[PDB]
RNA sequence: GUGGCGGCGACGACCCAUUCGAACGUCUGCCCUAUCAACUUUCGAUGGUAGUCGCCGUGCCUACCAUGGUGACCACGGGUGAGGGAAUCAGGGUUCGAUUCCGGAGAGGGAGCCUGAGAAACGGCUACCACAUCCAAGGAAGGAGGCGCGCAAAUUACCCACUCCCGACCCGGGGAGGUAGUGACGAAAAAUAACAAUACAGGACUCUUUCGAGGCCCUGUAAUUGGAAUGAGUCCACUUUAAAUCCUUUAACGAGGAUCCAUUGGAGGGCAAGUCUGGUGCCAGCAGCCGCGGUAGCUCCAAUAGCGUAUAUU
């Protein structure tokens, strides 16, 4: 029967990608897309030769198959290769809501389903979970998604936008494809889309990695030097094994008071490296030892790697140590208490973190998610014994900050390399650059120019800020990096916040600009505000409740979202300049889009080699842009000394301060506000 | 698998798509930006 | 005229009778055991009155009474291959005949519960006990036989055409029922040829411990020759049957070395420039598809689609 001939790029693709041990990406665009990933599923199986891959589907509300035996019986009730792939493979189903309970699990393969309720939260916990040489198919099901992947192709800077949300996030993604080198767009017929510019180029590798040498090099060089040589020996990765002698090191100290701290990232061992130095310290003469976080049921990889730790050395089940476990319905399957008996008397209790009581007699005490502790309990649990604390990346840098100023020994190491996969995968390169997960190492130090008197606000444009072009692209990062190094707390759907959420608007001031500047100015401060009220949100209606004010909620406003200052310019005055004169733009004080495709005129464009179009400016000066009269401004945030004094000088009045304080900060969101109805609610 | 090759047993847009003389990367490049609303283009 | 009279059917309906029954009694009659002689009142044994329950009569049961009932004429207790029987009809060359009738119980294990004329249900449910399955881990659904002998297909397929059963019904359904397979444990009948003719030779055959005695109306020849018969096989068509197979008819092919080639067991003959062993020069035993070179189908006996060996045995 005739038979097509499919290019070898897809499988020079798949098979280079299992030998490197990295991912790749895959973009299925059609309806019949489901086809598809049964095909691309087959191609890896035949490369890994571990095992059958496991699959990972995410979708959002609704699933064409049934995905139960018996109910897709009936429904049938003449042979479709999809519905034997159902069954065939073992699939693990997840929705985009719950996707938290996939989180620890590994699969050899992940489908996203659904394109248009693509979150920056839901692509970082599937993508980790794919594994070695996994591939990542995402499907483009919807009319929709076609004609807007058709309109950026033919001219970069025209879009298709229906009527609302402008959604730049996914055009943000689109136009982020080709920069990924394991990246192959694909048809519902296994047909390559060449816009990637890598794509033309590929080829297959000819038939060990430099960080895997010195691992093999320190397994064999620390035989010597044991039981140090056997926790190695069970480590996977080689910075965990440089964390694991520097764990030991600092046990070996005959010094009451001294830090080790790990800084580990997700997807590299964390708790695998605390579970072998609880066991090397069970392995020494270490008896009370405590281990604390905010719930057991979150260590159970620790106390593994400590069943694994002393599995190695002696420590047999029953023989030497006992274990008690939770025995309780909340909480189940954690064990608490664990006793080891072989060497006089040791024994490992977990407490709670409000447990600064009974830690009089204690020897070695582990603080686990350090970040998720309030930051008073943690100074508590400090105490005159050696002390290890991890925290995970993506206040603590000042309390080790602290340290590093005095008295406790103070010991530093960030995991980088990653358990699952091998370093260097242009897949997370990839995730991690459009996420915006990481800040630059080391900031330039520039000029600090008059703080309250030559400086002026701009208004940033939201759609050029998020075009991919490379002055966009740094600013972007530069704005972010100020962003995300406030006290406030950060999660990576911030990022659609700022490029999805109407009634936004970002403001900046920079420096007074001379004439000739190089490409990018520098950027001290940024605000972002949130327009209310009659131009739903927190103020309108929690004033409203308290207050019983039917005049309120008719009243126009907005609120200040996050306010923060470069760190080394922290502390000298840039912040209240941009209050004044965000006050003075919307009293009214100072004198007052990217072209749209229509609907029936998708198809009509033709590709333009040089784009034309002007696009819209960067920066905007105040008075260029009108402005809404605004009759009220407001602020929420956590109520803390610093901010108390800050915006009391700024002449915000409080209204309200919440009862309960928040679980992880310990702290009482606090509103005030600032324009006589004001002077009733302060009463 | 035949050791060279793989065989296996709306559009109108797509063989647009497919029939692409610049790639998307290539149209980037000439893509330019201006700040301050005037100014010598970035790129 | 919101006149008056009407036929033939269908379904339901109180009660009586009848049929199909079902259920408690009466009488008559059961195998072995006395090295079981006394038993019953060991949660009533016998009976009286009143009552509960039951479809009804009743120690069936409960209250209140009497002290009864059975037994050498064998009570009571204990046993008893209690696949085997029991019967029935039909028959000339002795019957390789045929068929039915049952003692109960259960539905993973013991209890409780629901319907109906009829069940303490061949079917629902709850609790407990024991199993086992799926899952996004929250919850949900469940009630028999083959091999172990070098060996696992009926553990199936077709049909309600026959016999009968259930239903609202002449017609629907029935794994009730009917039809269809392998087979040197065995038993029975039977092919692998028959009929003529010619030619050439001179010797058959019985008895007999090597001489010999009898004797012929024919014998042998892996000789030739002739045209009649037929089935093993091949293969049309009906008939059969719910459909089909099988049995019975039947058209056309199908024999000279008729090579279209019967076996199993016993006992003998024949041999070289051949091999080995032992002697009594030239011999004897054993045996002989093998030699110098060359590689392109003897005879006799016994049983006969059947015939031997080994162990034990009579
Ligand atoms: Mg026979
Ligand atoms: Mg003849």
New binding site residues.
């Given amino acids: 029967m005739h038979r097509k001939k499919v290019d070898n790029r897809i499988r020079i693709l798949i098979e280079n990608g299992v030998a490197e041990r990295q991912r790749s990406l895959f973009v299925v665009v059609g309806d019949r897309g489901k086809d598809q990933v049964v095909i691309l599923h087959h191609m890896l199986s035949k490369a890994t030769v571990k095992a059958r891959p496991s699959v990972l589907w995410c979708y959002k509300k609704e699933?064409g198959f049934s995905?139960?035996?018996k109910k897709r019986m009936r429904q049938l009730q003449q042979d479709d290769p999809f519905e034997l792939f159902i069954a065939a493979t073992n699939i693990?189903?997840?929705?985009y809501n719950?996707t938290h309970?996939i989180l620890g699990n590994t699969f050899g393969m992940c489908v996203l389903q659904d394109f248009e309720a693509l979150t920056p939260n839901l692509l970082a916990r599937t993508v980790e979970t794919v594994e070695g040489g996994g591939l990542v198919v995402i499907l483009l099901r919807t009319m929709n998604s076609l004609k807007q992947l058709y309109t950026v192709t033919m001219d970069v800077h025209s879009r298709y936008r229906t009527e609302d949300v402008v959604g730049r996030f996914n055009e943000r993604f689109i136009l982020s494809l080709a920069s990924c080198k394991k990246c192959l767009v694909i048809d519902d017929q296994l047909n390559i889309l060449p816009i990637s510019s890598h794509v033309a180029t590929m080829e297959a590798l000819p038939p060990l990695g430099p960080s895997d040498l010195e691992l093999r090099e320190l397994k064999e060089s620390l035989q010597d030097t044991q039981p140090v040589g056997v926790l190695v020996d069970c480590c996977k990765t080689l910075d965990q094994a440089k964390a694991v002698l520097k764990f030991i090191e600092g046990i070996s100290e005959k010094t009451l008071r001294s830090t080790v701290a790990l800084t580990a990232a997700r997807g590299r061992g964390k708790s695998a490296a605390l579970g072998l130095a609880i066991a090397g310290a069970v392995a020494f003469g270490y008896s009370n030892i405590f281990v604390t976080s905010p719930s057991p049921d979150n260590l159970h990889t620790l106390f593994e790697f400590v069943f694994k730790g002393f599995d190695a050395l002696q420590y047999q089940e029953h023989l030497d140590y006992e274990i008690i476990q939770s025995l309780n319905p909340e909480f189940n399957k954690a064990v608490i208490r664990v006793n080891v008996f072989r060497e006089h008397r040791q024994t490992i209790q977990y407490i709670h973190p409000a447990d600064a009581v009974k830690l009089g007699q204690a020897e070695l005490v582990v603080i686990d998610e350090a970040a998720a502790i309030p930051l008073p309990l943690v100074k508590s649990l400090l105490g005159p014994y050696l002390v290890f604390m991890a925290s995970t990346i993506n206040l603590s840098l000042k309390l080790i900050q602290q340290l590093r100023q005095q008295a406790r020994t103070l010991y530093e190491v960030s995991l980088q390399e990653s358990i699952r996969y091998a370093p260097g995968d242009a897949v997370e390169k990839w995730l991690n650059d459009l996420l915006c997960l990481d800040c630059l190492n080391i900031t330039r130090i520039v000029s600090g120019c008059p703080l309250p008197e030559a400086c002026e606000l701009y208004y940033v444009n939201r759609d050029t800020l998020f075009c991919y072009h490379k002055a966009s692209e740094v600013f972007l990062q530069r704005l972010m990096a100020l962003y995300v190094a406030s006290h406030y707390k950060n999660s990576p759907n911030d990022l659609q916040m700022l490029s999805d959420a109407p009634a936004h608007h970002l403001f900046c001031l920079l420096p007074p600009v001379p004439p000739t500047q190089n490409a990018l100015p520098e950027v001290l401060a940024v605000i972002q505000v949130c327009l209310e009220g009659e131009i739903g949100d927190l103020i309108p209606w929690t004033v409203s409740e308290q207050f019983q004010d039917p005049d309120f909620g008719g009243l126009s406003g907005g609120r200040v979202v996050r306010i923060a200052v470069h760190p080394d310019y922290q502390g000298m005055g840039y912040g209240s300049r941009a209050l004044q004169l965000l006050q003075m733009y919307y009293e009214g004080r100072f004198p007052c889009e990217i072209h749209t495709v229509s609907s029936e005129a998708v198809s009509l464009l033709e590709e333009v080699i040089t784009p034309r179009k002007d696009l819209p400016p960067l920066l905007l000066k105040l008075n260029e842009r009108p402005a809404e009269r605004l009759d009220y401004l407001g602020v929420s945030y956590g109520l803390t000394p610093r901010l108390l004094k800050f915006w009391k000088r700024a002449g915000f009045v409080p209204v309200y301060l919440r009862q309960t304080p928040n679980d992880l900060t310990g702290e009482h969101s606090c509103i005030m506000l600032k324009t006589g109805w004001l002077a009733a609610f302060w009463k | 698998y035949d050791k060279d090759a793989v065989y296996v047993d709306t559009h109108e847009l797509v063989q647009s798509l497919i029939s692409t003389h610049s790639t998307i990367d290539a149209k980037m490049a000439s893509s330019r930006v201006t700040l301050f609303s005037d100014s010598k283009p970035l790129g």
């Fill in positions: 699933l995905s139960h035996r693990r189903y997840c929705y719950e309970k």
